[PDB]
Every structure is written in structure tokens, then in C-alpha cells.
Amino acid sequence: PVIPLDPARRPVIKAQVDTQTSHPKTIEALLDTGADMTVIPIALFSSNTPLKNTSVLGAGGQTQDHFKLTSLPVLIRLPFRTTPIVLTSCLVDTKNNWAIIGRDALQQCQGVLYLP
Amino acid sequence: PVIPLDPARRPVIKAQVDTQTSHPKTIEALLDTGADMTVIPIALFSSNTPLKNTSVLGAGGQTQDHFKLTSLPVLIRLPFRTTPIVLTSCLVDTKNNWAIIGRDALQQCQGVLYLP
Ligand SMILES: CC(C)CNC(=O)[C@H]1N(C(=O)[C@@H](O)[C@H](Cc2ccccc2)NC(=O)[C@@H](NC(=O)[C@@H](N)c2ccccc2)C(C)(C)C)CSC1(C)C
């Protein structure tokens, strides 16, 4: 689709995310051109799966413990497209349950920004 | 222009920014659909400018000190538009001097996200 940009409304999409560690779930995710890497809520993973420690720089400072990195690829299906986005690795939100589609996924989408 | 999306290459643009407290300056800004509000560097202001305290939530955490709010509108000229974007207020990064064009500015130049 064409998604209009408005400060009062976050640009969101429904995405089916398969962590390959439990059953795929459809979630609402922010579409974010400022994110290098996609973020998935920890809730989407089985309780025992191995994750890696990671450090992330964001607007509030540098966090050492808020995010992890996945061990397995993540598959994402978007409502209009038949082909899964395959992400070799992405971020995992161990706290605030953020779901954010970043430029890794938008590239495999052929997503663009358009400014007339 | 059409701006393609690549995890390895941040979508950045040259923006002439007028704070109205000294002359217009060129910065290189991240184009960011996950940003509610535009962020400009404190380095654009001279030492004694009245700015408001504000609390901002990002991936790094909630911060009450890193960012301030402008007192006056901010004027932003992009290379391919003749009419200035005028933001009633925006964020001022006192800590790292980041430059981020958010949805406030992108709405005014009719920016869209496009997913085929
Ligand atoms: C975890 C990933 C996303 C790290 N990368 C980044 O964070 C990059 N940025 C991004 O990816 C931005 O699009 C970011 C998305 C985000 C919003 C709120 C909590 C977590 C993530 N947006 C912000 O940080 C922005 N904060 C907000 O817009 C804030 N009002 C907010 C609060 C809760 C939900 C949505 C929005 C500002 C400070 C730039 C205005 C801005 S700074 C960055 C390093 C270039």
C-alpha cells in the first residue's frame, strides 16, 4: 500500500512473525525507516530459547540489557505479499514488548520512502 | 525523490535548518518514520537560548535531560522543495547532537511510505 505519514498516528502494519521457536503469531508492528534492524517482542519466543547479549544505542541512551539478539532466523509474512521476509538475525525486546519493522525487512519488501 | 531502504545505509538528507536564533545551517538528517517529532542538534543554537525541559521515550530509555523543546518555530528547507517546512516546535538533542527528520516534517512535504 501507500502509507501516509502523520505525527499523530504511528505508521503500523499487521505482520505474522515466525521465530521458529514456537507457533507464528500475527502482531502489530511500527514501520520504521530509522531502525537498522527489526525488533520482536520476547513473548513470541519459547521460554527456554538461547538468545545473545547485545548493546543498543537509541534516543534514551545506550542499553546493555533491554534487547537480545536471536539465535535462529525469523520469518515475517506481510498481509499483501506471499513471500516470507527472512531475517538472519534481529532484536528481541525483553521488556517493553516493542514490535518494529526496520530497514532489513523493508528492503526485502522493496519498501521505499517517497517525497514528491 | 524515491528513497530506497537498506539496513546497511541510513536514509539521510541535507536540510537547511533555521532555528531563528542565528543564521540557517546545513545538517545531515536521518529520515525516520518511527519518530513522532523532529530532532535537531543543540549545536545549531548559541549558548543562551531559552529551551523547555521535556521527557522523551526512545529505545535507549525514557530521558528527562537529553532533549529540550524549542520555544520558537523551526524552519526547514529540503533540497527539492522551495517552500519551507515550519515546525511549531521540535526536539533539541543536547547530548549527542543528532539530526532526525520525523513525521511532523514528513507530513508537511507529503512524504509517504510505499510497500509494493
Ligand atoms: C531498537 C532500534 C529501533 C534502535 N534504533 C533506533 O532507535 C533509531 N531510532 C528509531 O528507530 C526511531 O524511529 C525510534 C523508534 C522508537 C520509538 C519509541 C521506543 C523505541 C523505538 N523513535 C524514537 O526514538 C522517537 N521517540 C518517539 O517518537 C516517542 N514519542 C515514542 C514513544 C513510544 C512509541 C512510539 C514513539 C524520537 C526520540 C526519535 C522522537 C531513533 S534513534 C536511532 C538509533 C536512529
Side-chain angles (χ1 to χ4, degrees), chain A residues 10 30 32-37 39 56-59 67 91 98 100, chain B residues 30 32-39 56-59 67 91 98 100 103:
Chain A
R10 271 143 210 156
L30 177 72
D32 195 356
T33 63
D36 300 347
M37 175 164 34
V39 186
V56 175
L57 185 61
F67 303 91
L91 288 164
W98 293 326
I100 299 172
Chain B
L30 179 72
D32 188 358
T33 62
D36 296 349
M37 182 177 278
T38 287
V39 179
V56 178
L57 178 67
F67 303 91
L91 293 165
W98 294 345
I100 300 175
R103 288 196 316 277

PDB file of all heavy atoms in Angstrom, chain A residues 10 30 32-37 39 56-59 67 91 98 100, chain B residues 30 32-39 56-59 67 91 98 100 103, ligand 1:
ATOM      1  N   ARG A  10       0.964   6.721  14.429  1.00  0.00           N
ATOM      2  CA  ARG A  10       2.080   5.827  14.097  1.00  0.00           C
ATOM      3  C   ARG A  10       1.801   4.939  12.877  1.00  0.00           C
ATOM      4  O   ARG A  10       0.757   4.308  12.815  1.00  0.00           O
ATOM      5  CB  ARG A  10       2.443   4.973  15.313  1.00  0.00           C
ATOM      6  CG  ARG A  10       3.475   5.649  16.185  1.00  0.00           C
ATOM      7  CD  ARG A  10       3.240   5.413  17.638  1.00  0.00           C
ATOM      8  NE  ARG A  10       3.711   6.547  18.442  1.00  0.00           N
ATOM      9  CZ  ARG A  10       3.250   6.856  19.657  1.00  0.00           C
ATOM     10  NH1 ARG A  10       2.291   6.128  20.216  1.00  0.00           N
ATOM     11  NH2 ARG A  10       3.738   7.894  20.322  1.00  0.00           N
ATOM     12  N   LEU A  30       5.306  -1.298  14.238  1.00  0.00           N
ATOM     13  CA  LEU A  30       5.665   0.033  13.713  1.00  0.00           C
ATOM     14  C   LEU A  30       6.578  -0.078  12.490  1.00  0.00           C
ATOM     15  O   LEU A  30       7.553  -0.834  12.494  1.00  0.00           O
ATOM     16  CB  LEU A  30       6.335   0.866  14.805  1.00  0.00           C
ATOM     17  CG  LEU A  30       6.885   2.279  14.505  1.00  0.00           C
ATOM     18  CD1 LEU A  30       5.780   3.256  14.319  1.00  0.00           C
ATOM     19  CD2 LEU A  30       7.768   2.726  15.638  1.00  0.00           C
ATOM     20  N   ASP A  32       9.386   1.499  10.497  1.00  0.00           N
ATOM     21  CA  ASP A  32      10.406   2.423  10.989  1.00  0.00           C
ATOM     22  C   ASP A  32      11.646   2.492  10.092  1.00  0.00           C
ATOM     23  O   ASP A  32      12.484   1.584  10.095  1.00  0.00           O
ATOM     24  CB  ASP A  32      10.797   1.994  12.399  1.00  0.00           C
ATOM     25  CG  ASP A  32      11.566   3.049  13.139  1.00  0.00           C
ATOM     26  OD1 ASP A  32      11.882   4.122  12.560  1.00  0.00           O
ATOM     27  OD2 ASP A  32      11.842   2.800  14.329  1.00  0.00           O
ATOM     28  N   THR A  33      11.763   3.579   9.334  1.00  0.00           N
ATOM     29  CA  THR A  33      12.928   3.781   8.462  1.00  0.00           C
ATOM     30  C   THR A  33      14.213   4.134   9.241  1.00  0.00           C
ATOM     31  O   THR A  33      15.334   3.986   8.703  1.00  0.00           O
ATOM     32  CB  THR A  33      12.632   4.778   7.331  1.00  0.00           C
ATOM     33  OG1 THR A  33      12.336   6.061   7.875  1.00  0.00           O
ATOM     34  CG2 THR A  33      11.420   4.303   6.470  1.00  0.00           C
ATOM     35  N   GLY A  34      14.060   4.550  10.510  1.00  0.00           N
ATOM     36  CA  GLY A  34      15.202   4.902  11.356  1.00  0.00           C
ATOM     37  C   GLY A  34      15.831   3.702  12.079  1.00  0.00           C
ATOM     38  O   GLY A  34      16.892   3.857  12.699  1.00  0.00           O
ATOM     39  N   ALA A  35      15.185   2.525  11.995  1.00  0.00           N
ATOM     40  CA  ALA A  35      15.690   1.255  12.591  1.00  0.00           C
ATOM     41  C   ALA A  35      16.549   0.422  11.621  1.00  0.00           C
ATOM     42  O   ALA A  35      16.052  -0.002  10.574  1.00  0.00           O
ATOM     43  CB  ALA A  35      14.513   0.397  13.089  1.00  0.00           C
ATOM     44  N   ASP A  36      17.813   0.155  11.978  1.00  0.00           N
ATOM     45  CA  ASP A  36      18.699  -0.688  11.147  1.00  0.00           C
ATOM     46  C   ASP A  36      18.183  -2.150  11.137  1.00  0.00           C
ATOM     47  O   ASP A  36      18.318  -2.874  10.148  1.00  0.00           O
ATOM     48  CB  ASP A  36      20.163  -0.682  11.669  1.00  0.00           C
ATOM     49  CG  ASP A  36      20.824   0.725  11.699  1.00  0.00           C
ATOM     50  OD1 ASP A  36      20.314   1.721  11.120  1.00  0.00           O
ATOM     51  OD2 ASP A  36      21.917   0.836  12.311  1.00  0.00           O
ATOM     52  N   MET A  37      17.599  -2.576  12.256  1.00  0.00           N
ATOM     53  CA  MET A  37      17.276  -3.979  12.498  1.00  0.00           C
ATOM     54  C   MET A  37      15.895  -4.076  13.121  1.00  0.00           C
ATOM     55  O   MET A  37      15.511  -3.235  13.936  1.00  0.00           O
ATOM     56  CB  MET A  37      18.373  -4.623  13.374  1.00  0.00           C
ATOM     57  CG  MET A  37      18.126  -6.053  13.824  1.00  0.00           C
ATOM     58  SD  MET A  37      19.549  -6.988  14.458  1.00  0.00           S
ATOM     59  CE  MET A  37      20.581  -5.769  15.318  1.00  0.00           C
ATOM     60  N   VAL A  39      12.794  -5.380  15.452  1.00  0.00           N
ATOM     61  CA  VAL A  39      12.583  -5.714  16.866  1.00  0.00           C
ATOM     62  C   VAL A  39      11.309  -6.572  17.046  1.00  0.00           C
ATOM     63  O   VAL A  39      10.238  -6.189  16.582  1.00  0.00           O
ATOM     64  CB  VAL A  39      12.448  -4.419  17.743  1.00  0.00           C
ATOM     65  CG1 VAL A  39      12.389  -4.765  19.233  1.00  0.00           C
ATOM     66  CG2 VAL A  39      13.597  -3.485  17.497  1.00  0.00           C
ATOM     67  N   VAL A  56      22.573  -1.759  22.535  1.00  0.00           N
ATOM     68  CA  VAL A  56      21.815  -0.983  21.547  1.00  0.00           C
ATOM     69  C   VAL A  56      21.854   0.510  21.891  1.00  0.00           C
ATOM     70  O   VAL A  56      21.570   0.894  23.024  1.00  0.00           O
ATOM     71  CB  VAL A  56      20.316  -1.470  21.437  1.00  0.00           C
ATOM     72  CG1 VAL A  56      19.500  -0.582  20.505  1.00  0.00           C
ATOM     73  CG2 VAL A  56      20.234  -2.897  20.959  1.00  0.00           C
ATOM     74  N   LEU A  57      22.208   1.338  20.910  1.00  0.00           N
ATOM     75  CA  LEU A  57      22.108   2.786  21.036  1.00  0.00           C
ATOM     76  C   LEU A  57      20.756   3.272  20.514  1.00  0.00           C
ATOM     77  O   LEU A  57      20.394   2.986  19.384  1.00  0.00           O
ATOM     78  CB  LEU A  57      23.241   3.465  20.257  1.00  0.00           C
ATOM     79  CG  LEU A  57      23.410   4.981  20.327  1.00  0.00           C
ATOM     80  CD1 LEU A  57      23.684   5.478  21.763  1.00  0.00           C
ATOM     81  CD2 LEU A  57      24.519   5.423  19.371  1.00  0.00           C
ATOM     82  N   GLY A  58      20.014   3.991  21.352  1.00  0.00           N
ATOM     83  CA  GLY A  58      18.727   4.553  20.987  1.00  0.00           C
ATOM     84  C   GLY A  58      18.613   5.944  21.565  1.00  0.00           C
ATOM     85  O   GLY A  58      19.529   6.386  22.256  1.00  0.00           O
ATOM     86  N   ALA A  59      17.494   6.625  21.300  1.00  0.00           N
ATOM     87  CA  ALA A  59      17.271   8.008  21.773  1.00  0.00           C
ATOM     88  C   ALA A  59      17.425   8.218  23.276  1.00  0.00           C
ATOM     89  O   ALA A  59      17.873   9.287  23.710  1.00  0.00           O
ATOM     90  CB  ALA A  59      15.905   8.539  21.310  1.00  0.00           C
ATOM     91  N   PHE A  67      17.602  -5.312  25.135  1.00  0.00           N
ATOM     92  CA  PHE A  67      17.439  -6.126  23.911  1.00  0.00           C
ATOM     93  C   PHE A  67      18.386  -7.321  23.890  1.00  0.00           C
ATOM     94  O   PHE A  67      19.491  -7.256  24.444  1.00  0.00           O
ATOM     95  CB  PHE A  67      17.643  -5.293  22.627  1.00  0.00           C
ATOM     96  CG  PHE A  67      16.729  -4.083  22.514  1.00  0.00           C
ATOM     97  CD1 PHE A  67      17.136  -2.840  23.008  1.00  0.00           C
ATOM     98  CD2 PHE A  67      15.462  -4.194  21.925  1.00  0.00           C
ATOM     99  CE1 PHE A  67      16.301  -1.725  22.920  1.00  0.00           C
ATOM    100  CE2 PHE A  67      14.605  -3.086  21.836  1.00  0.00           C
ATOM    101  CZ  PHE A  67      15.026  -1.845  22.326  1.00  0.00           C
ATOM    102  N   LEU A  91      16.450  -8.058  16.648  1.00  0.00           N
ATOM    103  CA  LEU A  91      16.487  -7.677  18.025  1.00  0.00           C
ATOM    104  C   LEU A  91      15.273  -8.255  18.679  1.00  0.00           C
ATOM    105  O   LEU A  91      14.245  -8.482  18.019  1.00  0.00           O
ATOM    106  CB  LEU A  91      16.549  -6.150  18.184  1.00  0.00           C
ATOM    107  CG  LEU A  91      17.869  -5.486  17.810  1.00  0.00           C
ATOM    108  CD1 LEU A  91      17.714  -3.993  17.634  1.00  0.00           C
ATOM    109  CD2 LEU A  91      18.964  -5.825  18.842  1.00  0.00           C
ATOM    110  N   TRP A  98       7.998  -4.106  22.372  1.00  0.00           N
ATOM    111  CA  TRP A  98       8.011  -3.342  21.113  1.00  0.00           C
ATOM    112  C   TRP A  98       8.107  -4.272  19.909  1.00  0.00           C
ATOM    113  O   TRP A  98       8.898  -5.228  19.906  1.00  0.00           O
ATOM    114  CB  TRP A  98       9.164  -2.306  21.072  1.00  0.00           C
ATOM    115  CG  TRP A  98       9.003  -1.169  22.084  1.00  0.00           C
ATOM    116  CD1 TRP A  98       7.824  -0.605  22.497  1.00  0.00           C
ATOM    117  CD2 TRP A  98      10.044  -0.464  22.788  1.00  0.00           C
ATOM    118  NE1 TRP A  98       8.065   0.395  23.416  1.00  0.00           N
ATOM    119  CE2 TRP A  98       9.413   0.501  23.615  1.00  0.00           C
ATOM    120  CE3 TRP A  98      11.439  -0.568  22.820  1.00  0.00           C
ATOM    121  CZ2 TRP A  98      10.129   1.360  24.459  1.00  0.00           C
ATOM    122  CZ3 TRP A  98      12.156   0.296  23.659  1.00  0.00           C
ATOM    123  CH2 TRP A  98      11.493   1.248  24.467  1.00  0.00           C
ATOM    124  N   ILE A 100       8.712  -3.652  15.852  1.00  0.00           N
ATOM    125  CA  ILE A 100       9.200  -2.590  14.968  1.00  0.00           C
ATOM    126  C   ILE A 100       9.789  -3.213  13.711  1.00  0.00           C
ATOM    127  O   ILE A 100      10.766  -3.964  13.786  1.00  0.00           O
ATOM    128  CB  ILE A 100      10.295  -1.708  15.670  1.00  0.00           C
ATOM    129  CG1 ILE A 100       9.750  -1.005  16.947  1.00  0.00           C
ATOM    130  CG2 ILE A 100      10.811  -0.625  14.732  1.00  0.00           C
ATOM    131  CD1 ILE A 100      10.841  -0.280  17.765  1.00  0.00           C
TER     132      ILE A 100
ATOM    133  N   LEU B  30      18.814  12.008   9.478  1.00  0.00           N
ATOM    134  CA  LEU B  30      18.156  10.714   9.273  1.00  0.00           C
ATOM    135  C   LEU B  30      16.664  10.894   8.999  1.00  0.00           C
ATOM    136  O   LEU B  30      15.985  11.579   9.760  1.00  0.00           O
ATOM    137  CB  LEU B  30      18.344   9.836  10.525  1.00  0.00           C
ATOM    138  CG  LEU B  30      17.697   8.430  10.501  1.00  0.00           C
ATOM    139  CD1 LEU B  30      18.414   7.432   9.557  1.00  0.00           C
ATOM    140  CD2 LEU B  30      17.608   7.860  11.929  1.00  0.00           C
ATOM    141  N   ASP B  32      13.095   9.468   9.260  1.00  0.00           N
ATOM    142  CA  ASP B  32      12.684   8.489  10.266  1.00  0.00           C
ATOM    143  C   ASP B  32      11.173   8.403  10.516  1.00  0.00           C
ATOM    144  O   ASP B  32      10.599   9.220  11.211  1.00  0.00           O
ATOM    145  CB  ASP B  32      13.452   8.791  11.549  1.00  0.00           C
ATOM    146  CG  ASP B  32      13.274   7.746  12.603  1.00  0.00           C
ATOM    147  OD1 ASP B  32      12.521   6.776  12.384  1.00  0.00           O
ATOM    148  OD2 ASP B  32      13.901   7.904  13.676  1.00  0.00           O
ATOM    149  N   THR B  33      10.534   7.378   9.965  1.00  0.00           N
ATOM    150  CA  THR B  33       9.085   7.237  10.094  1.00  0.00           C
ATOM    151  C   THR B  33       8.632   6.788  11.504  1.00  0.00           C
ATOM    152  O   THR B  33       7.441   6.928  11.858  1.00  0.00           O
ATOM    153  CB  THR B  33       8.506   6.287   9.022  1.00  0.00           C
ATOM    154  OG1 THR B  33       9.067   4.976   9.205  1.00  0.00           O
ATOM    155  CG2 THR B  33       8.798   6.816   7.588  1.00  0.00           C
ATOM    156  N   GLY B  34       9.567   6.258  12.299  1.00  0.00           N
ATOM    157  CA  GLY B  34       9.298   5.939  13.721  1.00  0.00           C
ATOM    158  C   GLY B  34       9.493   7.114  14.683  1.00  0.00           C
ATOM    159  O   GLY B  34       9.377   6.962  15.909  1.00  0.00           O
ATOM    160  N   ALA B  35       9.793   8.301  14.155  1.00  0.00           N
ATOM    161  CA  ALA B  35       9.949   9.480  15.036  1.00  0.00           C
ATOM    162  C   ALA B  35       8.682  10.361  15.000  1.00  0.00           C
ATOM    163  O   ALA B  35       8.341  10.913  13.973  1.00  0.00           O
ATOM    164  CB  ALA B  35      11.197  10.276  14.638  1.00  0.00           C
ATOM    165  N   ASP B  36       7.987  10.484  16.126  1.00  0.00           N
ATOM    166  CA  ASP B  36       6.826  11.355  16.222  1.00  0.00           C
ATOM    167  C   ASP B  36       7.205  12.790  15.887  1.00  0.00           C
ATOM    168  O   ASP B  36       6.411  13.517  15.285  1.00  0.00           O
ATOM    169  CB  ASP B  36       6.224  11.344  17.636  1.00  0.00           C
ATOM    170  CG  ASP B  36       5.670   9.983  18.047  1.00  0.00           C
ATOM    171  OD1 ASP B  36       5.543   9.073  17.206  1.00  0.00           O
ATOM    172  OD2 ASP B  36       5.355   9.826  19.243  1.00  0.00           O
ATOM    173  N   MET B  37       8.405  13.200  16.316  1.00  0.00           N
ATOM    174  CA  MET B  37       8.792  14.598  16.254  1.00  0.00           C
ATOM    175  C   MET B  37      10.230  14.702  15.807  1.00  0.00           C
ATOM    176  O   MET B  37      11.044  13.848  16.142  1.00  0.00           O
ATOM    177  CB  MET B  37       8.574  15.288  17.625  1.00  0.00           C
ATOM    178  CG  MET B  37       8.904  16.802  17.639  1.00  0.00           C
ATOM    179  SD  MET B  37       8.590  17.676  19.217  1.00  0.00           S
ATOM    180  CE  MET B  37       6.825  18.022  19.147  1.00  0.00           C
ATOM    181  N   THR B  38      10.529  15.766  15.060  1.00  0.00           N
ATOM    182  CA  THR B  38      11.849  16.064  14.529  1.00  0.00           C
ATOM    183  C   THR B  38      12.834  16.394  15.661  1.00  0.00           C
ATOM    184  O   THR B  38      12.433  16.954  16.692  1.00  0.00           O
ATOM    185  CB  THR B  38      11.740  17.193  13.472  1.00  0.00           C
ATOM    186  OG1 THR B  38      11.142  16.645  12.287  1.00  0.00           O
ATOM    187  CG2 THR B  38      13.097  17.827  13.078  1.00  0.00           C
ATOM    188  N   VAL B  39      14.101  15.985  15.473  1.00  0.00           N
ATOM    189  CA  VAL B  39      15.205  16.235  16.427  1.00  0.00           C
ATOM    190  C   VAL B  39      16.314  17.007  15.724  1.00  0.00           C
ATOM    191  O   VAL B  39      16.757  16.613  14.645  1.00  0.00           O
ATOM    192  CB  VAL B  39      15.820  14.909  16.963  1.00  0.00           C
ATOM    193  CG1 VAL B  39      16.962  15.176  17.909  1.00  0.00           C
ATOM    194  CG2 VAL B  39      14.769  14.046  17.638  1.00  0.00           C
ATOM    195  N   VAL B  56      11.283  12.416  26.955  1.00  0.00           N
ATOM    196  CA  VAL B  56      11.177  11.726  25.667  1.00  0.00           C
ATOM    197  C   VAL B  56      11.435  10.237  25.843  1.00  0.00           C
ATOM    198  O   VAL B  56      12.393   9.859  26.511  1.00  0.00           O
ATOM    199  CB  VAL B  56      12.226  12.257  24.617  1.00  0.00           C
ATOM    200  CG1 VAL B  56      12.106  11.491  23.316  1.00  0.00           C
ATOM    201  CG2 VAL B  56      12.070  13.751  24.359  1.00  0.00           C
ATOM    202  N   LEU B  57      10.603   9.402  25.220  1.00  0.00           N
ATOM    203  CA  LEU B  57      10.815   7.943  25.221  1.00  0.00           C
ATOM    204  C   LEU B  57      11.439   7.448  23.905  1.00  0.00           C
ATOM    205  O   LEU B  57      10.938   7.740  22.819  1.00  0.00           O
ATOM    206  CB  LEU B  57       9.506   7.196  25.506  1.00  0.00           C
ATOM    207  CG  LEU B  57       9.520   5.663  25.499  1.00  0.00           C
ATOM    208  CD1 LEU B  57      10.355   5.077  26.654  1.00  0.00           C
ATOM    209  CD2 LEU B  57       8.094   5.135  25.563  1.00  0.00           C
ATOM    210  N   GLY B  58      12.547   6.719  24.029  1.00  0.00           N
ATOM    211  CA  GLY B  58      13.194   6.070  22.909  1.00  0.00           C
ATOM    212  C   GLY B  58      13.594   4.653  23.269  1.00  0.00           C
ATOM    213  O   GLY B  58      13.275   4.180  24.347  1.00  0.00           O
ATOM    214  N   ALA B  59      14.320   3.999  22.365  1.00  0.00           N
ATOM    215  CA  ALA B  59      14.846   2.644  22.558  1.00  0.00           C
ATOM    216  C   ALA B  59      15.905   2.558  23.661  1.00  0.00           C
ATOM    217  O   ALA B  59      16.094   1.488  24.277  1.00  0.00           O
ATOM    218  CB  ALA B  59      15.414   2.109  21.248  1.00  0.00           C
ATOM    219  N   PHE B  67      17.001  15.729  25.899  1.00  0.00           N
ATOM    220  CA  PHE B  67      16.298  16.543  24.902  1.00  0.00           C
ATOM    221  C   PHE B  67      15.564  17.720  25.535  1.00  0.00           C
ATOM    222  O   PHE B  67      14.995  17.600  26.632  1.00  0.00           O
ATOM    223  CB  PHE B  67      15.279  15.700  24.127  1.00  0.00           C
ATOM    224  CG  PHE B  67      15.871  14.508  23.444  1.00  0.00           C
ATOM    225  CD1 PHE B  67      15.932  13.273  24.095  1.00  0.00           C
ATOM    226  CD2 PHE B  67      16.359  14.611  22.157  1.00  0.00           C
ATOM    227  CE1 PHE B  67      16.479  12.153  23.456  1.00  0.00           C
ATOM    228  CE2 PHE B  67      16.909  13.488  21.506  1.00  0.00           C
ATOM    229  CZ  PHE B  67      16.967  12.264  22.150  1.00  0.00           C
ATOM    230  N   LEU B  91      12.234  18.743  18.844  1.00  0.00           N
ATOM    231  CA  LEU B  91      13.148  18.313  19.878  1.00  0.00           C
ATOM    232  C   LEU B  91      14.544  18.825  19.563  1.00  0.00           C
ATOM    233  O   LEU B  91      14.931  18.976  18.379  1.00  0.00           O
ATOM    234  CB  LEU B  91      13.134  16.771  20.048  1.00  0.00           C
ATOM    235  CG  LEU B  91      11.826  16.195  20.604  1.00  0.00           C
ATOM    236  CD1 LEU B  91      11.743  14.693  20.417  1.00  0.00           C
ATOM    237  CD2 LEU B  91      11.612  16.566  22.077  1.00  0.00           C
ATOM    238  N   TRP B  98      22.207  14.698  17.493  1.00  0.00           N
ATOM    239  CA  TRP B  98      21.526  14.007  16.405  1.00  0.00           C
ATOM    240  C   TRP B  98      20.599  14.914  15.609  1.00  0.00           C
ATOM    241  O   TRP B  98      20.099  15.918  16.115  1.00  0.00           O
ATOM    242  CB  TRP B  98      20.723  12.836  16.937  1.00  0.00           C
ATOM    243  CG  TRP B  98      21.579  11.735  17.533  1.00  0.00           C
ATOM    244  CD1 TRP B  98      22.929  11.559  17.376  1.00  0.00           C
ATOM    245  CD2 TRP B  98      21.127  10.642  18.337  1.00  0.00           C
ATOM    246  NE1 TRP B  98      23.342  10.446  18.050  1.00  0.00           N
ATOM    247  CE2 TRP B  98      22.258   9.857  18.649  1.00  0.00           C
ATOM    248  CE3 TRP B  98      19.875  10.250  18.828  1.00  0.00           C
ATOM    249  CZ2 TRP B  98      22.179   8.692  19.433  1.00  0.00           C
ATOM    250  CZ3 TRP B  98      19.798   9.075  19.613  1.00  0.00           C
ATOM    251  CH2 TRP B  98      20.944   8.317  19.897  1.00  0.00           C
ATOM    252  N   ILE B 100      17.328  14.299  13.079  1.00  0.00           N
ATOM    253  CA  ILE B 100      16.350  13.283  12.689  1.00  0.00           C
ATOM    254  C   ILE B 100      15.102  13.980  12.157  1.00  0.00           C
ATOM    255  O   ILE B 100      14.462  14.705  12.896  1.00  0.00           O
ATOM    256  CB  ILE B 100      15.979  12.402  13.910  1.00  0.00           C
ATOM    257  CG1 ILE B 100      17.239  11.700  14.462  1.00  0.00           C
ATOM    258  CG2 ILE B 100      14.859  11.411  13.558  1.00  0.00           C
ATOM    259  CD1 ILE B 100      17.022  10.891  15.739  1.00  0.00           C
ATOM    260  N   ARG B 103       7.982  12.486  11.424  1.00  0.00           N
ATOM    261  CA  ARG B 103       6.719  12.504  10.694  1.00  0.00           C
ATOM    262  C   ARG B 103       6.067  13.886  10.669  1.00  0.00           C
ATOM    263  O   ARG B 103       5.292  14.182   9.753  1.00  0.00           O
ATOM    264  CB  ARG B 103       5.762  11.464  11.298  1.00  0.00           C
ATOM    265  CG  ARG B 103       6.187  10.017  10.971  1.00  0.00           C
ATOM    266  CD  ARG B 103       5.033   9.024  11.234  1.00  0.00           C
ATOM    267  NE  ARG B 103       4.333   9.264  12.500  1.00  0.00           N
ATOM    268  CZ  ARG B 103       4.732   8.830  13.697  1.00  0.00           C
ATOM    269  NH1 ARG B 103       5.838   8.104  13.792  1.00  0.00           N
ATOM    270  NH2 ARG B 103       4.001   9.105  14.796  1.00  0.00           N
TER     271      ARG B 103
HETATM  272  C1  LIG C   1      15.673  -0.577  18.846  1.00  0.00           C
HETATM  273  C2  LIG C   1      16.091   0.021  17.483  1.00  0.00           C
HETATM  274  C3  LIG C   1      14.841   0.755  16.969  1.00  0.00           C
HETATM  275  C4  LIG C   1      17.285   1.002  17.719  1.00  0.00           C
HETATM  276  N1  LIG C   1      17.444   2.061  16.693  1.00  0.00           N
HETATM  277  C5  LIG C   1      16.826   3.371  16.942  1.00  0.00           C
HETATM  278  O1  LIG C   1      16.223   3.518  17.962  1.00  0.00           O
HETATM  279  C6  LIG C   1      16.957   4.559  15.936  1.00  0.00           C
HETATM  280  N2  LIG C   1      15.650   5.423  16.070  1.00  0.00           N
HETATM  281  C7  LIG C   1      14.371   4.892  15.683  1.00  0.00           C
HETATM  282  O2  LIG C   1      14.286   3.810  15.250  1.00  0.00           O
HETATM  283  C8  LIG C   1      13.158   5.786  15.859  1.00  0.00           C
HETATM  284  O3  LIG C   1      12.333   5.611  14.760  1.00  0.00           O
HETATM  285  C9  LIG C   1      12.514   5.450  17.226  1.00  0.00           C
HETATM  286  C10 LIG C   1      11.540   4.271  17.262  1.00  0.00           C
HETATM  287  C11 LIG C   1      11.245   4.006  18.744  1.00  0.00           C
HETATM  288  C12 LIG C   1      10.242   4.888  19.493  1.00  0.00           C
HETATM  289  C13 LIG C   1       9.943   4.641  20.980  1.00  0.00           C
HETATM  290  C14 LIG C   1      10.653   3.468  21.695  1.00  0.00           C
HETATM  291  C15 LIG C   1      11.662   2.572  20.936  1.00  0.00           C
HETATM  292  C16 LIG C   1      11.953   2.853  19.454  1.00  0.00           C
HETATM  293  N3  LIG C   1      11.826   6.672  17.567  1.00  0.00           N
HETATM  294  C17 LIG C   1      12.265   7.451  18.701  1.00  0.00           C
HETATM  295  O4  LIG C   1      13.157   7.111  19.418  1.00  0.00           O
HETATM  296  C18 LIG C   1      11.473   8.746  18.893  1.00  0.00           C
HETATM  297  N4  LIG C   1      10.608   8.656  20.063  1.00  0.00           N
HETATM  298  C19 LIG C   1       9.169   8.832  19.890  1.00  0.00           C
HETATM  299  O5  LIG C   1       8.708   9.085  18.811  1.00  0.00           O
HETATM  300  C20 LIG C   1       8.297   8.676  21.167  1.00  0.00           C
HETATM  301  N5  LIG C   1       7.286   9.738  21.321  1.00  0.00           N
HETATM  302  C21 LIG C   1       7.560   7.317  21.104  1.00  0.00           C
HETATM  303  C22 LIG C   1       7.249   6.566  22.418  1.00  0.00           C
HETATM  304  C23 LIG C   1       6.523   5.201  22.361  1.00  0.00           C
HETATM  305  C24 LIG C   1       6.096   4.589  21.000  1.00  0.00           C
HETATM  306  C25 LIG C   1       6.404   5.339  19.679  1.00  0.00           C
HETATM  307  C26 LIG C   1       7.134   6.695  19.739  1.00  0.00           C
HETATM  308  C27 LIG C   1      12.308  10.062  18.869  1.00  0.00           C
HETATM  309  C28 LIG C   1      13.038  10.276  20.218  1.00  0.00           C
HETATM  310  C29 LIG C   1      13.365   9.984  17.725  1.00  0.00           C
HETATM  311  C30 LIG C   1      11.341  11.237  18.569  1.00  0.00           C
HETATM  312  C31 LIG C   1      15.881   6.834  16.653  1.00  0.00           C
HETATM  313  S1  LIG C   1      17.439   6.860  17.284  1.00  0.00           S
HETATM  314  C32 LIG C   1      18.115   5.600  16.203  1.00  0.00           C
HETATM  315  C33 LIG C   1      19.363   4.954  16.835  1.00  0.00           C
HETATM  316  C34 LIG C   1      18.477   6.230  14.849  1.00  0.00           C
END
